[PDB]
Amino acid sequence: GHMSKKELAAQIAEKFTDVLSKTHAEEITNFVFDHIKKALVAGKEVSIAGFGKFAVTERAARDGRNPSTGETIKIPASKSAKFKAGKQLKTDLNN
Amino acid sequence: GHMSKKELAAQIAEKFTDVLSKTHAEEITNFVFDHIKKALVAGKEVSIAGFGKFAVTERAARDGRNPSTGETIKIPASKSAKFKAGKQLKTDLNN
Ligand code: NA
Ligand code: NA
């Protein structure tokens, strides 16, 4: 199965209709992930208790070879973000 | 740096004070991740546009050996959840 962000936001809106509208639920859901992204972009690890942690990772630069010339190259570094599932999520998935 | 769930919820509360209280911001932030967990527990992939995707993964069972006896064992399967950062997050981290 699948659950999208819009579906998440719709569930928020349905379960918190006393708190906020469907439009605000979508705004806030978008803000959750935007803010998490902003934090990763700022180099922060984002820890979400009961859920897990996000950290920026960097594929390190390293020596390669030009295959044709056997000249030393640099394979460039690049960043990504990694999630490590927390203990509670791991427990819930293994029940 | 670090950003926790409480800090995320506090940012939500600060930036959406017209929408919800600090208490509700924490409730909703907790619900976001609880609901995502519920979806993974239900076997759903959770796709969050602009952010990335979570999927349940299973470390497959496989043959091991009892080291001492050379009897065939089974190393048990276990589930976890994996996140794959979306293109936009990858772009933002590499800017
Ligand atoms: Na609305
Ligand atoms: Na409050």
Author numbering:
A (entry chain A), B (entry chain A): -1 to 93
Kindly provide excerpts from the paper associated with this entry:
HU proteins are the most abundant DNA-binding proteins in prokaryotic organisms and play an essential role in processes of DNA replication, repair, and recombination. HU proteins are small (approximately 90 amino acids per monomer) basic dimeric proteins that are annotated in the majority of bacteria with sequenced genomes. All HU dimers feature a compact architecture, including several intertwined α-helices, two three-stranded β-sheets, and two disordered arms that are flexible in the absence of DNA19. Recently, the HU protein from Spiroplasma melliferum KC3, an insect parasite infecting honey bees31, was produced in E. coli, purified, and crystallized, and the three-dimensional structure of this protein, referred as HUSpm, was solved at high resolution.
In the present work, we analysed the three-dimensional structure of the HU protein from the insect parasite mycoplasma S. melliferum determined at 1.4 Å resolution and found that it has unusual thermotolerance comparable to that of HU homologues from thermophilic bacteria. The monomer of recombinant HUSpm consists of 95 residues including an additional Gly-His dipeptide preceding the N-terminal Met, which was introduced by the cloning procedure. The monomer is composed of the following three canonical components: a helix-turn-helix (HTH) domain, a dimerization signal (DS) consisting of residues 48–52, and a flexible extended “arm” region — the DNA binding domain (DBD) region — responsible for DNA binding. As is seen in all known HU proteins, which are either homo- or heterodimers, the functional unit of HUSpm is a homodimer composed of two equivalent monomers (one monomer per asymmetric unit) related by a crystallographic twofold axis. Unlike other HU proteins with known three-dimensional structures, there are no salt bridges across the dimer interface in HUSpm, although a larger number of hydrogen bonds are formed compared to other HU proteins. An interesting feature of HUSpm is the presence of hydrogen bonds between the β3 and α3 regions (Lys77-Asn92 and vice versa) and between the α2 helix and the loop that links strands β1 and β2 (Gly48-Lys35 and vice versa). An analysis of the three-dimensional structure of HUSpm demonstrates that residue Phe14 of one monomer is located near Phe29 of the other monomer, which is favourable for the strengthening of the hydrophobic contact. In HUSpm, this cavity is also absent, which may be attributed to the amino acid substitution at position 31. The non-conserved Phe14 and Phe29 residues contribute to strengthening the hydrophobic dimer contact, the semi-conserved Phe31 is responsible for the absence of the internal cavity at the dimer interface, and the Lys35 and Asn92 residues are involved in the formation of unique hydrogen bonds between the monomers.
